[PDB]
Amino acid sequence: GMATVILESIFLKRSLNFKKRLFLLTVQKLSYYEYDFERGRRGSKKGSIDVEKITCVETVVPEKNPPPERQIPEQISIIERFPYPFQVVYDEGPLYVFSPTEELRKRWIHQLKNVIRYNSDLVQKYHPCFWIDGQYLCCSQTAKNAMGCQILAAAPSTAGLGYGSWEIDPKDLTFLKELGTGQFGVVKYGKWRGQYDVAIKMIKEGSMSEDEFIEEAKVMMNLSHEKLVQLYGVCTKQRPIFIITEYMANGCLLNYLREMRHRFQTQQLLEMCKDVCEAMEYLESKQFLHRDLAARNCLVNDQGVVKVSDFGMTRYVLDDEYTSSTGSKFPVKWASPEVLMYSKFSSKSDIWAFGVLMWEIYSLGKMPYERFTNSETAEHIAQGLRLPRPHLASERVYAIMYSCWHEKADERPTFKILLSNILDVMDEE
Numbered sequence: 001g002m003a004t005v006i007l008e009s010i011f012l013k014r015s016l017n018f019k020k021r022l023f024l025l026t027v028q029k030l031s032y033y034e035y036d037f038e039r040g041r042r043g044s045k046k047g048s049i050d051v052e053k054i055t056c057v058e059t060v061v062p063e064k065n066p067p068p069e070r071q072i073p074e075q076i077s078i079i080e081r082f083p084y085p086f087q088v089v090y091d092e093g094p095l096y097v098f099s100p101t102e103e104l105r106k107r108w109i110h111q112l113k114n115v116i117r118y119n120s121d122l123v124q125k126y127h128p129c130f131w132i133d134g135q136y137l138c139c140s141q142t143a144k145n146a147m148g149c150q151i152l153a154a155a156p157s158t159a160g161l162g163y164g165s166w167e168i169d170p171k172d173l174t175f176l177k178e179l180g181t182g183q184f185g186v187v188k189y190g191k192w193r194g195q196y197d198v199a200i201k202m203i204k205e206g207s208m209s210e211d212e213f214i215e216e217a218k219v220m221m222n223l224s225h226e227k228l229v230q231l232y233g234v235c236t237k238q239r240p241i242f243i244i245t246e247y248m249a250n251g252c253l254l255n256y257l258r259e260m261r262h263r264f265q266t267q268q269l270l271e272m273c274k275d276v277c278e279a280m281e282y283l284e285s286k287q288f289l290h291r292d293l294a295a296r297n298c299l300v301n302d303q304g305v306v307k308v309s310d311f312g313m314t315r316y317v318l319d320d321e322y323t324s325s326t327g328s329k330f331p332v333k334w335a336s337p338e339v340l341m342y343s344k345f346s347s348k349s350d351i352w353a354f355g356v357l358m359w360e361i362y363s364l365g366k367m368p369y370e371r372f373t374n375s376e377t378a379e380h381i382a383q384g385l386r387l388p389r390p391h392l393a394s395e396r397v398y399a400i401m402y403s404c405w406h407e408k409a410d411e412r413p414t415f416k417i418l419l420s421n422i423l424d425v426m427d428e429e
């Protein structure tokens with residue numbers, strides 16, 4: 001996955017002694033340390049739990065008589081008063097943590113519950129109350145590893161798509177239609193447990209760095225936005241492996257644009273841009289690059305909503321004709337000059353590509369730089385060649401896409417700024 005800290009908070013931890021600890025969560029580990037107040041950083045490490053060993057995270061029933069420091073009834077209190085407990089359940093008994101606020105406890109529980117979907121020894125039951133004086137107060141059982149006495153409200157074993165085990169059973173898939181092929185081979189439409197529509201990407205053996213994708217899915221499983229194609233899970237206990245996603249009935253945006261019968265109004269085209277920009281603002285906020293943003297990599301559902309697809313997947317492509325910046329399959333005509341010249345990938349190369357995508361949308365799927373080959377494009381865009389204003393784009397709309405192609409990456413806007421510009425034009429109309 002990634003070594004990035006997803007959540008950082010100061011909590012009160014129970015050993016019976018209670019101590020303030022800085023908790024840091026990564027997809028790999030939940031670690032806690034003494035808090036270096038003076039330096040505003042972590043102090044000495046005091047322990048850690050491997051995320052793969054966590055079987056359950058849930059609230060705890062509060063103690064009936066907790067001292068003032070833990071009594072339910074801003075700056076000073078949020079680091080001195082900890083009344084809301086939660087438990088992290090793993091092999092070595094539960095770990096009890098007290099949050100200063102309810103919102104913060106909710107945030108940690110929500111995040112941890114999603115993360116542990118990846119794990120293999122998940123439980124359906126837990127202990128609602130504290131283990132104290134050699135027994136659980138809820139059921140009076142005397143073993144710390146005693147099975148939970150109460151079923152979880154949304155136990156993963158019985159949870160629906162997006163909340164269940166990350167590994168999906170392929171025997172629960174029905175295949176109904178061929179959706180064509182892409183960089184990793186065949187894709188199909190089908191049903192999960194006979195009711196839920198899904199897309200099944202079947203990974204051609206030898207096309208993907210599978211072990212890296214499977215591990216790194218720990219990060220991608222946390223990406224969720226209304227305008228991102230949702231990843232539901234994987235099937236990796238067979239050959240080939242499958243990637244299971246949200247199904248988009250209308251296919252890829254590029255082919256959608258090229259279907260002349262739609263006869264889109266320019267308001268509809270701007271809405272497509274807004275959809276994509278919202279997805280990209282979300283990915284930018286998670287410091288996650290797409291690296292092949294283009295109309296061909298966006299999909300359209302049966303409601304006409306555009307969503308961004310296959311973000312982050314370039315990293316696992318084994319084909320050097322795709323990966324090489326001069327390869328026949330590399331997306332040269334969406335690549336910023338710095339990418340082509342120096343392999344300088346950043347949020348700003350995604351911004352460049354977004355501009356070309358806006359141009360595609362207002363050109364109804366025309367090939368960019370049609371008069372030029374990939375090699376010619378690479379040479380001339382580094383000199384200052386730019387895509388001209390599409391006939392359907394107003395000067396104001398063109399200014400947005402044009403801003404994406406500044407020769408200096410740092411003078412390119414962010415997706416937050418682009419979205420603001422798009423919303424302004426929608427109002428102005």
Ligand SMILES: Cc1c(NC(=O)c2ccc(C(C)(C)C)cc2)cccc1-c1cn(C)c(=O)c(Nc2ccc(C(=O)N3CCOCC3)cc2)n1
Nearest residue numbers: 179180181182183184187199247248249251292310313314
């Ligand atoms: C994403 C995708 C690829 N492309 C890839 O898998 C791919 C892999 C890697 C990359 C990188 C280069 C970035 C690494 C890019 C793309 C190839 C084929 C289909 C789909 C796809 C997916 N989903 C989630 C749908 O809902 C859907 N829905 C469709 C719905 C309808 C139709 C359609 O109109 N059809 C089907 C066949 O022909 C008849 C009409 C087609 C697709 N189509």
Ligand SMILES: [Ca+2]
Nearest residue numbers: 249250251256
């Ligand atoms: Ca269609």
Ligand SMILES: [Zn+2]
Nearest residue numbers: 127138139149
């Ligand atoms: Zn119990």
